[PDB]
Amino acid sequence: GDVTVILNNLLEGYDNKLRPDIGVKPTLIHTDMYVNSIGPVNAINMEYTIDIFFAQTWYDRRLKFNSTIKVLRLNSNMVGKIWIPDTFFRNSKKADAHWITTPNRMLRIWNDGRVLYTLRLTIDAECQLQLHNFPMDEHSCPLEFSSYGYPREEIVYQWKRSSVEVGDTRSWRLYQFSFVGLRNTTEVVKTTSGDYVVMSVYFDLSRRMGYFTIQTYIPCTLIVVLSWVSFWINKDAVPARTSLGITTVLTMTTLSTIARKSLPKVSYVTAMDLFVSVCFIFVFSALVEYGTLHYFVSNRRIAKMDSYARIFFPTAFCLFNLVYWVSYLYLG
Amino acid sequence: TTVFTRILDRLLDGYDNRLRPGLGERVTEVKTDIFVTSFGPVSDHDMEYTIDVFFRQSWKDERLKFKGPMTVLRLNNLMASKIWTPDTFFHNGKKSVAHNMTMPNKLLRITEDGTLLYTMRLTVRAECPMHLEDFPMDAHACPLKFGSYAYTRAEVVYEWTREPARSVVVAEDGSRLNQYDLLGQTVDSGIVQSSTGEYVVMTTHFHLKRKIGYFVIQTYLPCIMTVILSQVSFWLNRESVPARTVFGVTTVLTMTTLSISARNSLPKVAYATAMDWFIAVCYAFVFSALIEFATVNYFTKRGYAWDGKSVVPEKTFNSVSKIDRLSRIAFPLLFGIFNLVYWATYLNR
Amino acid sequence: TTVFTRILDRLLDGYDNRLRPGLGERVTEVKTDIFVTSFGPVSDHDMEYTIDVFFRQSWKDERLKFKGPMTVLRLNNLMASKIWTPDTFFHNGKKSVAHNMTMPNKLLRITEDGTLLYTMRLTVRAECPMHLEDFPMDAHACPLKFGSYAYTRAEVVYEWTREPARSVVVAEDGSRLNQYDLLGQTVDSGIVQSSTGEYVVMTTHFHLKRKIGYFVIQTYLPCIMTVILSQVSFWLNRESVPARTVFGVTTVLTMTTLSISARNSLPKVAYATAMDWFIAVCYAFVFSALIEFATVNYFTKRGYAWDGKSVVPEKTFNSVSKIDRLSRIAFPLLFGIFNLVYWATYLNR
Amino acid sequence: NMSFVKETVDKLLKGYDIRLRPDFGGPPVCVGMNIDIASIDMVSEVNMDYTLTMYFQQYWRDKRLAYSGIPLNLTLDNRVADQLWVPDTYFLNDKKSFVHGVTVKNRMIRLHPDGTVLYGLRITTTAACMMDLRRYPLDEQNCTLEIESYGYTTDDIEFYWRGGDKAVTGVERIELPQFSIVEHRLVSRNVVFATGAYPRLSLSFRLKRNIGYFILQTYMPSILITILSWVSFWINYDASAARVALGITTVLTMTTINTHLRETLPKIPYVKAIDMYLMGCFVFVFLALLEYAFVNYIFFGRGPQRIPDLTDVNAIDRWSRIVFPFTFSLFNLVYWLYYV
Amino acid sequence: NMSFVKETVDKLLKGYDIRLRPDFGGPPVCVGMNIDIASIDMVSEVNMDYTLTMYFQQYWRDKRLAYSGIPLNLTLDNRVADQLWVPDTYFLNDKKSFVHGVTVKNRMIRLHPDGTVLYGLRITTTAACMMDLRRYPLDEQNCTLEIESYGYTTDDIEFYWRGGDKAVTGVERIELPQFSIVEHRLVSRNVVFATGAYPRLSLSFRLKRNIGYFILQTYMPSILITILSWVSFWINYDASAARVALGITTVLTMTTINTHLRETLPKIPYVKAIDMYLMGCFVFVFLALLEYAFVNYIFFGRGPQRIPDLTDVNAIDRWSRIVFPFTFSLFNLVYWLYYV
Ligand SMILES: *[C@@H]1O[C@H](CO)[C@@H](O[C@@H]2O[C@H](CO)[C@@H](O[C@@H]3O[C@H](CO[C@H]4O[C@H](CO[C@H]5O[C@H](CO)[C@@H](O)[C@H](O)[C@@H]5O[C@H]5O[C@H](CO)[C@@H](O)[C@H](O)[C@@H]5O)[C@@H](O)[C@H](O[C@H]5O[C@H](CO)[C@@H](O)[C@H](O)[C@@H]5O)[C@@H]4O)[C@@H](O)[C@H](O[C@H]4O[C@H](CO)[C@@H](O)[C@H](O)[C@@H]4O[C@@H]4O[C@H](CO)[C@@H](O)[C@H](O)[C@@H]4O[C@@H]4O[C@H](CO)[C@@H](O)[C@H](O)[C@@H]4O)[C@@H]3O)[C@H](O)[C@H]2NC(C)=O)[C@H](O)[C@H]1NC(C)=O
Ligand SMILES: *[C@@H]1O[C@H](CO)[C@@H](O[C@@H]2O[C@H](CO)[C@@H](O[C@@H]3O[C@H](CO[C@H]4O[C@H](CO)[C@@H](O)[C@H](O[C@H]5O[C@H](CO)[C@@H](O)[C@H](O)[C@@H]5O)[C@@H]4O)[C@@H](O)[C@H](O[C@H]4O[C@H](CO)[C@@H](O)[C@H](O)[C@@H]4O)[C@@H]3O)[C@H](O)[C@H]2NC(C)=O)[C@H](O)[C@H]1NC(C)=O
């Protein structure tokens, strides 16, 4: 009854084609974001999924009303009846609002004309990853949003006190990454259609090491140690040490292709590539070590090369591991 | 015929579907029940599950009372878009589907007292966080939470139609699970607090236990057979260096392929699972059996084996290694003990 | 400005787009032609293919005659939804897209006599049933049938705009085939029967021949080299038992991997393709080489090979196996003869 | 004459209430159904579903649509279906479906003078059918389509197959690469939920899997590797490097055969018929290798210290040359007789 | 203020005919276009396409939308684009595309006092380019984006790049993990079809594939395996098991290297530059294994009967120690000069 009359009075003569204060001042929009979950990080596509409750608040003097009712708590029905900012996410690869069982949107109008607009979003956001330190890499994946058509002279966004909120991180789908922290910034980006106020959230992410230690580092280390068993086998066992030497190289070839299967086909050398390549050099050199020993003893000090290899090979791999892990875990 | 057209016209004449029933006067109470027509597959990679439901909602709306030759109007689902319905959404819902074939899979029924029945057929994809430390002997409680998106608990409250246990019903033949068992469901309700107010949330937890049969056949048995195969080389003579080297290297490489192929089903989690520990210990047993032979070969003096016609005076011939003799007992015993400890650790818990 | 607005308003005033032109007077005759902008990839596994077309239709509507400053009204696509258009659909289509980026890719043109031209950009995914007995040296005629969905041949008939061979035109640069050659298209017309009457069907068959280049590189050449590799062991001395056994076993393992991996992109058909026959015979040649050595090894009297010093009359030494000497000729000859028969059989089909 | 048709159709839809079924408040409206199956494909054991494309026709009578003076069956533009009441038909086991929309929505409306409506739709549906894979790949599957009214109970609507057993056509022309349709069956019953009893039509197909693919892919490679492992029994006991390498690789090769087969099937918690064969063939290659280790141990372990004799290695090898081929054929005899 | 603006905008749309283009029945309307590229991703050789995100802006003058008294460029809510004529621009090679719709449809309409309309869209399009992979992975592709009017011919509409060479921005900020964008250029031309001549704008990029990824994954593993097959040349000819195991493993390893690369590419019928190298490395490791068989046959097959000597077994091994590293270096010298 009375609420129907108020709603009809607000929309009588209302033109939702016009931004509030269209020729007076810019529209100030206060934005909030509640992160329900930061989904998986897709390194191959350089993207991540984030589920947010995106809240916007502005003032529309055309929506003022006087009554005992201090606020109109409404569903999504009136969202298309009033003016709504054309907020979009600038690095969104693919985004979708939710529609089950109804459009997950909220509209609340106060008697002073203040409008609160909230909706639930899932966003596949672009995040360019520098994988040089992979799998010990750290990233700060952004999430930028602005107005699509209204420049800085027409729409201005502004972070509130509790800008970005994150819930129970333990329920998130960050399998290989840990959420470290977030920052929210404001800037003006100049395009060809004008200057736009762009709001960004950066999510710092550190890769968890455990998966690639199990998947690659431990298998590659064991094949390197496997190649050292040849050094303690009698040099007269030509088929035994040749088969042992060549199968480790074959296995190290198989591990190399598996290691990069989870990455984009970047053309620089990651920390994973360096470890695999050095492990390739160790298994390669062990077979060459026996070939030299076999040639100089049978197919003929050099004869004592096995005793040297029993120490030099384990010490060089320990030394390389000490340098490799220190440089990539504490250095640059 | 026109009698019912005038009733429907009168119901919508002056009706405002922007306003909930009892607005400014009371709290809209929505009765809810779920009929699970199928419990779809659980996706380990996405940590989510699929579920096809009849999502039934019921509430009172005095604006839709009528008097006519019928007590219930069983109307086309086109009518539901003209009236206020609850804005229920799934809190942990991912991309869900409202079925539209061949028509919107919704029903609306209006009784003469104003009570509304509003059910829809939905394919719901909901997040199910998983702790895979016990995989493949893990169990999960996959939640399904829903409530009003826009109306706080002072405006819309949800209740179950019947006793909470009997308000979520699963069809007898609806199980679409392949590697899980539906032990049962727990039904509850509560309040969720946000920055925009307090909201009623309705919760259902489905309890799923993974079935280990697939992983026994494809992972555990090949691992166990590989470890048994690696201990075969203990019984060969110490002079069969190429033969006993092929035993050790092939089984080590086989365990390497098994370990890498084992996690292809799982999401790339950063912790070790129960299967990873079994494979790691199997790797240690296989690796040690090759390391055992290297120690045996280090103490092998002569390059020729016993010719079969000479008595060893305990030319001369190498003796049977004491390391080989002890490994014939120690390795099967330790691996048998590990299996006892491993299975009792996880099957009992 | 207002001159052309008044014309369009007059045309649509009292116009019923539920009624086909000539309903109750004659048959609506629709002239059709197709411009193929790209013949997209063929999917063997789904037995389908993709095609991108400018699908053009033309019919007469006496309700749309006009007189004005222009003889042809080139209007945007939203006028097409205001008038009657044919309900053409593709009989063998699976999931077709009518592109609407950035606007509906449709054009409507009305001439003063009432003739309408109505073209749309479509991406049709159509069924192409395949017989893969001759794979990978097979050829297929992929059909593209279309016609009215609801109107029978007593109400709507379709005809080609020009000579039927010239009414389906493929662009010179429009070829997205990777492993097929488009050799041409045959264009025909016919009548189909259903439960609701007789319908005109317009048919196009696209004649595709598979390009064998990929499968020569990835399957045929590795198989031929494995067979040649397996016969290398015939030239090794009969006392190299570990060496010649590794030759036989590894080549069999390689042939097993090749045989299993060679049907990855094909539908799981119940018959044998030409590739499956080639791999079977290659497997038999590889398998029989290891059987050949086992026969040779069964008559090796001594475990030691020739020392390089002692004369061999005709201590004692084994002689070169007669089975080996015949195998050094028979095996290469029988595989060469099989290839001559195999390639003459299928490259001539 | 064309103006008379336009006037007649306008008269039908004037005052028509799309919210009300025919005979609203009266006897249930009877809906007759026919299906012309265009194709069945994508029968997935991984997803436990099949994809079905069909021409789906519904046949009911709406007395509000009766017209006189026109001795014709009015075929109207399919957009008129949005101005008429149509049954709320849905498929219960439908996972993902769509009405084709090229070039227009593949939908037919044909009115008849007495008020009969023919409503046709070209539908591609991916319906669910759980498959018992215990006898896979020598299994028969039964996959159904459950047709039901969503909002109307048996008091408001009744389904029936129009034409009896001839309601569904085109089944005999369906060609599946991996299946042959043994038969199809039409069922009409009622299903009760908490909201009432609803009419249901069930169309079911019995699918028998062709085994010709699996002979080439799994069975024959497994048989040949098992036969290959018997070659060791003709090699001398002292050739340890040869017999171990032959025995080890065949054991390894069996895993390679199994993993490829595993990758193309769902996570099944029970043993399939194909699993029994692979595990049977793995035992034979494993025992053939264990046979040599026993032979090697007898000669080199128990030699210096001084059913076959179990003391002569030649006897054990010659015993193996007979028992191993004989037992494997016995296993194949029992296996193939039980699953055929 | 706001009353006048609302009065003005309502005046523009009153009597506006969206069915008629600007200057309908008169001169062609000139439409200028600017593109700001957000990113390029999913450059797929398997699917022969690339995915492009861009801000697609169109510039034209509609004198029916001229307004006076308001010294402002009116940015209206993007739903007004449904009430205005806009060019029916389409992308000929566009396989799949969408306008982003979060939080609203990513669309902009900005009016100007003289009647000029700025219409921007944020579009992600998967456009097809057929790639010539004969030099893969050292290939240089050229992927385009055809921009055309569908229903309006050059008599009705004209296209041009607004800003000439500056019409497309953001190309220098694109980071493709596998390619580097060497150059982009803009082309304007007309295309003739059976229905008329239509204006076409063409934007094309030249993508040069990076080689560093393939050095680590395909080239270095092949070189190391080829070098390790030469180790058998320093092994004693008596060690048949050692040299056959070394020879067989490298041949087997080369196949495994090729299968991993094979599975991530389309099924093109020609030989790629990577295939030429892998075939070359296969020949080298195959001939090394064949080198021992010749050595084995000379010592044992012809020894009792009784440029390298071809009768001295050790002479052949010495010859192979020099020729194989030399010829492989010659093969690498020719291969890399031809493709770099
Ligand atoms: C190329 O062509 C394609 C099509 O081939 C085209 O895509 C189409 O784009 C148009 C827009 O241009 C879409 O139309 C709008 O869609 C809006 C929502 O879109 C989202 O939801 C879609 C499904 O919606 C269903 O469910 C919701 C609730 O969950 C319901 O509101 C809808 O009506 C609809 O319900 C029907 O279907 C369900 C089953 O699905 C049934 O159960 C139900 O019974 C009913 O039959 C979904 O499909 C969309 O996904 C697409 O788009 C996303 C990107 O956004 C993409 O990621 C996906 O992949 C996919 O492509 C999407 O999620 C909808 O709100 C609009 O409806 C408005 O406006 C129309 C205007 O005519 C009006 O008629 C409606 O009543 C409604 O009025 C609004 O509603 C507002 C809701 O917030 C409200 O605030 C307003 O106040 C007003 O409310 C009403 O107003 C009326 C009038 O005053 C009043 O009487 C009422 O009482 C009430 O107050 C509109 O439908 C269309 O859906 C797209 N189709 C497809 C297949 O994608 C594409 O754009 C073209 N491209 C180009 C470049 O041209
Ligand atoms: C795939 O698997 C599915 C699921 O198992 C198979 O579907 C089943 O097919 C069989 C065979 O066609 C069905 O049995 C038949 O059902 C019909 C219909 O029954 C309904 O309508 C009757 C009136 O026409 C009505 O009387 C029935 O009610 C009685 O039965 C129900 C059963 O639960 C009972 O609850 C009631 O109290 C009644 O007693 C019911 O509403 C029926 O007409 C058939 O009767 C024939 O056979 C019986 C003997 O069985 C005989 O007495 C009759 O004279 C007549 O000859 C028959 O019962 C079954 O209903 C289907 N089940 C489902 C769930 O769909 C499907 O066939 C499989 N496919 C293939 C290809 O094999």
Ligand SMILES: CCCCCCCC(=O)OC[C@H](COP(=O)(O)O[C@@H]1[C@H](O)[C@H](O)[C@@H](OP(=O)(O)O)[C@H](OP(=O)(O)O)[C@H]1O)OC(=O)CCCCCCC
């Ligand atoms: C993981 C493996 C760790 C291995 C650790 C191995 C640690 C270690 O150093 O062992 C040496 C010894 C080797 O015994 P093994 O029987 O293998 O070797 C014999 C031994 O060396 C004799 O002393 C030799 O006789 P001799 O008098 O020289 O003439 C004999 O020569 P011959 O008879 O041919 O003429 C050799 O064959 O092993 C143990 O005593 C078992 C300890 C427990 C081993 C427990 C192993 C689990």
Ligand SMILES: CCCCCCCC(=O)OC[C@H](COP(=O)(O)O[C@@H]1[C@H](O)[C@H](O)[C@@H](OP(=O)(O)O)[C@H](OP(=O)(O)O)[C@H]1O)OC(=O)CCCCCCC
């Ligand atoms: C798959 C082929 C299966 C063939 C099965 C063939 C089964 C079969 O009967 O083999 C016997 C014989 C073995 O030939 P092979 O040369 O290997 O064996 C020699 C033969 O046994 C001589 O008789 C021995 O001399 P002796 O007199 O004892 O002093 C000689 O001893 P030694 O000189 O070494 O000390 C042996 O080496 O082969 C054929 O005659 C070729 C048949 C056609 C072969 C056709 C092959 C295509």
Ligand SMILES: *[C@@H]1O[C@H](CO)[C@@H](O[C@@H]2O[C@H](CO)[C@@H](O)[C@H](O)[C@H]2NC(C)=O)[C@H](O)[C@H]1NC(C)=O
């Ligand atoms: C997000 O932005 C808000 C401002 O919108 C930041 O809050 C400000 O923090 C500074 C700290 O020196 C205070 O002086 C301001 O008064 C704060 N503004 C408020 C509360 O409105 C907040 O720190 C930002 N979050 C980041 C950068 O992580």
Ligand SMILES: CCCCCCCCCC
């Ligand atoms: C070409 C690589 C050869 C490796 C073995 C060399 C053995 C002899 C060294 C003098």
Ligand SMILES: CCCCCCCCCC
């Ligand atoms: C790292 C490989 C070790 C193999 C056994 C060595 C035993 C040495 C005993 C002195």
Ligand SMILES: [Cl-]
């Ligand atoms: Cl193709």
